Amino acid sequence: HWGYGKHNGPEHWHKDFPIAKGERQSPVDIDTHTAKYDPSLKPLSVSYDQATSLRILNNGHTFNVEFDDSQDKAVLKGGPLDGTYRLIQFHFHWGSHDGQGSEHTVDKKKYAAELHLVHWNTKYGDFGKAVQQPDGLAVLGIFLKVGSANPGLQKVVDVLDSIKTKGKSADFTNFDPRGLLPFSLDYWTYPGSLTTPPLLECVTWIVLKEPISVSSEQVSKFRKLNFNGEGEPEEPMVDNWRPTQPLKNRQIKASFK
């Protein structure tokens, strides 16, 4: 019912999801000169040592790596957050070519891809309750810059040929998401939304300044996925990104001076 095509794409999402034109929509452009250091931010704590990946799936929009979120096995704390946020899945957005694909931009520059690690606030008990609250979700956003091959991505790349069409999934256990993090956790933060329908304004965005690498060959494997289901005309899964939205009455804060 929604997608990234001419008919069903970001320019038309507002018809069925009028919040698409709301106060706190994502992604946004990050102006690095006007994002101000915020000394009230606490240190950011990523605790992924016990993370338990389960499956990888093509949902017709991207591919998701799903985690066991029945316990505090992989959590995000600190920074702008109050309380504990549990990892439920991560996924990517990417382009048709290396010069586009990210959702957030930095001084109007696009990266080749962007990684989203989605976490929900445990005080709401269940992801489905959390997404209804303004402090329900915390999404780590990590930019991918084409350069050297990334070993922490390779297990993902290697399984993508098994989930080429919408609705396919594969077993995906023992994947360590720490291998997808940059070495510095310096970040920008702002209040926003899911970047796909239903576009709910429940997200504390934490966008890391340091990108991770991806080889040309690795991102080319992302582009061999398809939006369509089996037996339908082929629609390559590329350019599954929403363009940036107006900042409106928000500020982007920096964790670093």
d(CA 194, CA 19): 11
Q: What angle do CA 240, 241, 243 make, to 5 degrees?
A: 145
Residues 6+ apart with CB under 8 A from 110: 95, 99, 100, 101, 102
Beta bridge partners of 138: 119, 204
Please tell me whether residue 77 binds Zn ion under the rule CB under 5 A.
no
Q: Of 225 and 257, which has the nearer Cβ to Zn ion?
A: 225
d(CA 188, CA 160): 31
Q: How many CB atoms lie within 10 A of CB 111?
A: 25
116 marked as binding residue: yes
7 marked as binding residue: no
Residue 227 beta carbon to Zn ion: minimum distance, rounded to whole angstroms? 15
Residue 135 beta carbon to Zn ion: minimum distance, rounded to whole angstroms? 19
Catalytic site positions = 61
Scan residues 153-212 and list those touching Zn ion (CB under 5 A).
Answer: none
91 marked as binding residue: yes
14 marked as binding residue: no
Residue 93 beta carbon to Zn ion: minimum distance, rounded to whole angstroms? 6
Beta strands 203-208 and 187-192, pairing class: antiparallel
The number of residues that bind Zn ion (CB under 5 A) is: 1
34-42, 115-123, 182-190, 230-238 -> range binding Zn ion (CB under 5 A): 115-123
24, 77, 104, 116: which one contacts Zn ion (CB under 5 A)? 116
Residue 116 beta carbon to Zn ion: minimum distance, rounded to whole angstroms? 4
Beta strands 105-106 and 29-30, pairing class: parallel
Six-digit token string for 23: 């106060």
112-120, 163-171, 219-227, 230-238 -> range binding Zn ion (CB under 5 A): 112-120
Six-digit token string for 37: 């250091």
Residue list, annotated binding site: 91, 93, 116, 195-196
Site for Zn ion, rule CB under 5 A: 116
Residue list, annotated binding site for substrate: 195-196
